[model samples]
Target chain A: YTRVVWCAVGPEEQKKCQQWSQQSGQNVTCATASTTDDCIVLVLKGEADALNLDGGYIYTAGKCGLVPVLAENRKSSKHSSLDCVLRPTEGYLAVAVVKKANEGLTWNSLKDKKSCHTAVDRTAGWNIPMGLIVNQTGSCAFDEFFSQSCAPGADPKSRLCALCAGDDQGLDKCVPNSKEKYYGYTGAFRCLAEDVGDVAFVKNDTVWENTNGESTADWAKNLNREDFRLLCLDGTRKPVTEAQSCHLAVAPNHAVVSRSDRAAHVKQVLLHQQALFGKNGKNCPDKFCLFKSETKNLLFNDNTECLAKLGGRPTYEEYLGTEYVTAIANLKKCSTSPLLEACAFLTR
Target chain B: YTRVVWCAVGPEEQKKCQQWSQQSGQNVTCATASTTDDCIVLVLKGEADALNLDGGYIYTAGKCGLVPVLAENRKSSKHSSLDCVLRPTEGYLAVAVVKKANEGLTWNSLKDKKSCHTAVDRTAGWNIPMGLIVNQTGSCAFDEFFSQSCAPGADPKSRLCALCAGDDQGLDKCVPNSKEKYYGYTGAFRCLAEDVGDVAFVKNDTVWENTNGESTADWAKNLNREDFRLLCLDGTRKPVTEAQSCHLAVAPNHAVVSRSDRAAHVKQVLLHQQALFGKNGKNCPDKFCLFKSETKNLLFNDNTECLAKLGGRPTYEEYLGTEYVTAIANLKKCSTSPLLEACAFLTR
Candidate 1:
């Protein structure tokens, strides 16, 4: 019955939440944590009410009996008359992007390449692409598959973190925080865009949202949609627009989740709050847009159209989807998440 | 590629399919069966290519190695800017309806009452309500719970078929076909409308679509939305508009399913096929609208917006969502589905 408490991952998201708190007449408040896993912990312990999460983290929270409340609906490439909130969540297209100049580096040529990842346990950036490599090569040694990867959450001294550049002070090198230069989707793509890595594993929309004048960030200001090519499974390369067929996998969209008992309340509050701060909300741009984060993706993705209503209050597994769930299960065989393991230990 | 072979359930559906075949320039052909089960078997054996199926039947086909290709997205009660085909399939709100004049009747009064059903193995009509009943009371004798019912696919001579009004000629009562006057969503609601049953198990859209002059059918033309009430689980009654909070369960929408090998081709053809015959297709009304069924629901539901794309190649289990699938699993424990059993044996 009180203000819905959102669990923010880090300091930047905390600031966004603070702004959202003031803008929403205190309908929503904040609970900040150092990482997504820590945020999930906050929600699990009732210190927070809900938070938006990638499919991989959804699995972690879901296994602990947290239910998905609302899914993040983004811009659709195809047109329809239905409202975005009522539209079903389409999985974001997970694609591997490289500079078009790297013509010789198709999917088949990535064995020893330097890679950029959103984080160690994220969906497109890690689980999917790594799962496929592990399956194809029948090897559990994903740490060695990519010669070097800026994979946040890996040992900061490990080769996996070699490509990562830390904050302005040059500290916290491989941490899974926005402060790490190659830490999240924007940072990972920045790595590939700046030629720090041979390829960047991120969703299709990321390229569009940050390039071609979409983002004013200095590093991305001059990026063009034409500068990138997607590496397809068939050993061929394609323009970014061709991601429909040239993607590594289709990752489920980020969605909000809460403890089962708090789901209905959380859903009600988020739905009402979005109406005032959503993409087309009456008060957006002038008074805090919830979907916009100045291209840093502090709280929710910049491309989110709305925090869409889910069909049937789906459980975490259902919302994450079965195939993707299975894929995550397989990927965990190579190495599991300590955050997930920690949740399991505590919940148990 | 060869033409997509559609498996029609009965004579009416065959006729519909035949018309569609011609309208589609022979891009599709038909293989008629006496029932949906037989059609699934045909698809299993490659005698027919694909068909749209209720969630229960989808379970049967999926268990036999068939894959879901396209989900049927319907008209949205809420507005969105996404194209209908790109929208996520929100599970239809399954509701229990009774005449408002029956002021004393509620979900609690349904025990030992005459009932009307869409069919034996359907989503809203059978599985959701019956599953809830069985789970709550821990009783398997659904036949005895309802004093008399018109559940198609049940034994014709049984009390379960006592309320069914056969065709005008007075034959084939209780058959899961258009001939049986209470065999589908429309017919079941008609049974309630005509005072043959105390309650009708159907979807939320059914009430709106068939009433208030939405349909020109003689039985529904004069019917008003105010004449009906939705039965809620808490032993209360609410107007139909309150189904979001009052419905029994949210049943997965009907979707097109095919053999995994044929899924891609089926998807391609259906997408192209719908553009010509879909709700806003250029050739619809004049040529053929793939979604319209004139209250008979011959091949597809009358309310289809488009055959929307599935995000990620979701397995049937994923498409149905985890809880509904588990509910189906639970109900099957009470009495097994012979249709599903048959498929399992054949596939094995």
Candidate 2:
């Protein structure tokens, strides 16, 4: 059987993989890995087949001989699977956001202010914005810029999680796990909405989706986009949609990575599985929907419309592009963490 | 009923239209027009719904308010329907050819050589190559450049038909009808093979397909590509596959045109019809195949692999491109004929 190794950060995602296994019948099987690194290790050892990965992890997976088979295409952009063929427009820009009442705050004045971030090493939430900071501050110590911040995956006692509120009982405080209340795109938006942080560093869509009640959380249910603004490099603020011209650097979209030997098998099973549970799938109208998670992004991003074929499988260098690789390399220099160290070893 | 007006050149095409009408069941009906110009008039008058036309006619049809709905994508090119977004590479190049043994005849020295052509107004055979000649000669009288030419659709009494042998019975002599012995890509190659013309003007694929026995005709059965060579404008010759650097001009692929008001209806019916008779359709393995006609290009060219969607229908000027339209307009000035005059009136 073709085993699909789902790299999940929590129990909720593990359950989703189990459900997909039942739906795929006898030809395919589903397995789980607790971390992105674990999933890469499993695929390398032939215990698993494929998994979707964020751009940062995709770079690591590629150096390990895993190739990108399918790209998670979002409906918000006009890009196709042929982004390698034509220069695709940079993905959503990473931006800093604050309430309109915080008129004194700007990119330069964000020092010592409460900050909320999607996660560590994520291109938008960490790499792009933090890479600029590391170059400016000359160190990995971002705790100095923000008096109290909630940068999930940063060391817990390092003052980065000073303002972070864990899920209910504070069980997984400052943990890289999704079990942390302030993690991922939606979780970071929630941190700002609850007034835990003065500024939220995330992708452009994080603000629009939450403020518009598309997120469905009670905290974000009544959020107003007009009441919020983006932090520009020029120390001014603008609406969320104008991030194209004024914001932090852009990042690549998430993609599905598979070993080159099992790429065809993974592609076949995924296409068949998507036809049943993906966006507009046969069971999407009622039973367990894959791409419509509301607040929880499981094995894949909830906003994904479909997984488009990458035509011929491109090598790691060919698929991620030179600009993206340079961005990641620049960030890894100052932001060395245990997770980043583990990913680096896999590439070596 | 949804009416499809197929642009045809002979009785064989008219019969093919009748067969498709029966195959379409009650929801759709098929009609025939003897020329591409006639089909455009029927569409303008709302008597017919759609027809496929060469790029030159697409420009004329576009000026008259018709839009291109589906493009006839050929199997030989690596391009997709999305090339409409970017400037698509030319589908094929126009080239002039002469028997390698009959040396000394080049583009500049062809003042008294017998020539053969696919048809008038066709991109490769007439518009591109003829457009260049008209620019140099300062007139529409191509009969002066060559001693005589077998250009189908030219006035029968004109010197253009001096070398044309016509059908054995001479019933369709020098006419655009398929019954003419020498009329299309393969037909022009046949004209050179039979010694009726010393040179043949056609697309790059003409010699490769005919000489390799892909044409399956007695005259083309024993032919070899080494026997002929391309006549470049700079007074040099090259192999057939080298059209990328040594040819007259590049041209767009053939596309299906329809009135914008009926585009949705036409697109729906064609997609359904293609599912039955297209290259790999359900009936293609047993019954009549729409895309596999050999020796006869009834309603559409046999080389077509499929009718791909043009997204939302693109306007004539948008689909055929500006450079191609200007070339046809230049050819229209000096080579005005009754058919060209009729098409011009429709444009007005």
Candidate 3:
């Protein structure tokens, strides 16, 4: 059996990632949504046969699971976005991310740069990443671990994405597909039909509303084919960088070609300026004219690790290549949006 | 002068609403918006001198004005939407509609008919009719009001909006507007702005938010055209329905219209929907098309109380129109949407 966790900070952490994967006798892969700095995707192999992993159990944010919460603790005034659960019998694991906890605040607050120790901080600061953990024992690992965001000085009112509990022990934390702010969605294996094609979505309680009195929810549900383009994130680009503007394009993912049988790892494209136009693999200017640009690797110069992520700074080759591979992979998996291609760069 | 007192409901025979207006010798109005049931919109019209209406005040529902509140009060919680203030001492005669209130549920909650009562109705069903108020007394008659929708069983973890007490006795409320669900904004009239297009506004806590990892204070700030439009309700048949749905095209207190300025009654249009979409209007229908069809009367019947009304059984219309009219008039007169032309058949 194997287990997978979506977000792991750096590409160098491959040893830890592989160690766990090898021990569990499952193939492990590490990938990231290069769109923003805070987003990390870590894949683990091996499923625990004992712990039931389903529903918004304790693993999910603002939810309960096999982990027993110490007591009825309302979120503290500080770091209100931080939340976690404990298993009475197992070790406890916690999860934190850089996103709004609820809604209502200024841009500075949502993007609050300070390290969030308060509820407000945990929600907006991109540097304050969401953390997730689970121990080897059948028990939980941490205490009060599932905080929504970690942005400091952030307006305490913003909310994070929809979160669900993973197994009875861990939370299945992933970007929500349908919410106030929506990214495109594809299916995951082993989930019920109802929960398929899930995208990372949250309500646009922050942005100026679109027409039709319909919120992002309504719009996304009724989104035209063009509007539903894949959003690939240039994980290398951080939110704080001036050059790092999020790039949204109608591209493809690598799984489109590699995975012969099933189209696994199909994802939308969400990239920061630094990832695509600014400096990533494809050195395009702010205008991403080189979308179909040749693929290149982001080099980090590490032998043990894939040097594709070079400069540690978002490189043009890696940026273009990441997008290209993901876009191509996604294309083989899903239909491409002609309209999204008609337009140039996507605005974040 | 005919003296009328808002005698408590139970102990006394039904008090004549008209008589109370006359006796109060003040402008009486009604309340609209996200009202809790047991709320009402009272409109008063007259002189303050004759009946000692001067701060004799009025009391109803769960709240009280200068008038002594008796236990037998039949005043169900209408959360006065509009009120007439006569500060004879200050020689200030003014009217305020509870666009946002310190003591009422938000429009989001009101949209959920079942939860309406749960949120506001302390004694009976919580549902409060939507719309504005027309109060003779110089005070807001209802707690708060708006024309918006809230999802049923919204995650309890989501942010909640409410009214507040300002520096003075000034009223205020917040709306969810952020990166998460219900992310939008609120504004205040700051020294009446210099912009001439519409009434200038000062972004204030009246548009408070507790989500997106922000503090209540984070919600209190001035919003730009885009922000304000997003924060305000969508009057025309544009896409996006929630408050966050408002974008560049939306204008506060007005209808969405491209034809002519005369066709635009920003204030009136907002008010029209405020009334029509009240809790009492729940029986109207779930289809946005129905509301679109009834847009004409909304403009033509500017003075016809039913403009911003969801006309249904005579009984229902009566209840909504009476409490919401004064609230409507209070809005800065604005434009109407092209949909207003179809409003007539909507009620049919």
List lDDT for all candidates, in order. 0.84, 0.72, 0.21
For model 2, the stretches where C-alpha displacement exceeds 4 angstroms are A1-348, B26-28, B76-90, B339-348
Residue-level lDDT for A176 in candidate 2: 58
Model 1 interface DockQ = 0.01
The top-ranked prediction according to TM-score is 1
Clashing pairs in 2: A112-A145
Worst 10 residues of 2 chain A by lDDT: A81-90
lDDT of 1 by residue, B159-202 (tens): 88899878888887788877787878899998999999899998
For each of the candidates, give the backbone clash count. 9, 1, 277
Docking class of 3: incorrect
Deviation from native of the Cα of residue B275 in model 2, angstroms: 2.5
State the DockQ, from 0 to 1, for candidate 3.
0.01
Candidate 3 ranges beyond 4 A from true positions: A1-15, A21-348, B1-342
For candidate 2, what is the DockQ-based docking class? incorrect
TM-score of each: 0.50, 0.47, 0.18
In angstroms, give how far residue B12 of model 3 lies from its true place: 33
